[PDB]
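User: Dehydroascorbate reductase family protein, Populus trichocarpa:
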Amino acid sequence: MALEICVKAAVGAPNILGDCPFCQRVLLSLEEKKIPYKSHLINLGDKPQWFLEISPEGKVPVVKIDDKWVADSDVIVGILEEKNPEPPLATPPEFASVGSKIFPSFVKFLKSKDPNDGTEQALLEELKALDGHLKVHGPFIAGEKITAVDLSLAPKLYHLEVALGHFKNWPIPDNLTHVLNYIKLLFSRESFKKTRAAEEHVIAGWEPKVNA
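Assistant: Predicted structure for Dehydroascorbate reductase family protein:
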């Protein structure tokens, strides 16, 4: 019945959830569905036998779905939907195949301190396609509402918008009017605002590995 999470901690601050992608996918999905809920963080290397039984690295997010546990970026979502008693919508169609261009793209580019400028605009080209899908369909990326498509991509786009926004400043241009407008919703939907990671612990938490 009640379901929730054993996740990476914000590094150096074990109260807010961590800078991992799949961590916020499933947290967002459950708070958007507004279910009763269970578990809490794995506190940064504090790994008793309970978490070593649950999480495969001892430091990887999982879902605790009615006391069964799974952990890979899609598996964590799809089985969570299947075993949720509230009606799920586990549908990744064309909107997700466009999303599969964008997801590794913006992660690589925020991580990249290349001469990335023409290639930053190659992410803009893939976002221009995404801009096209909402301006034809109306609502959120999956065409009618937040489904598994939006729930997969939006959590790591929050990590984009805090990290790239502070380290290597590139705001979303307003010519990509969809992408800017709906990211504004993602920053403050009641579910997303509650499940957001700490800004400082993505910025000074994910990039020091990228630096040194």
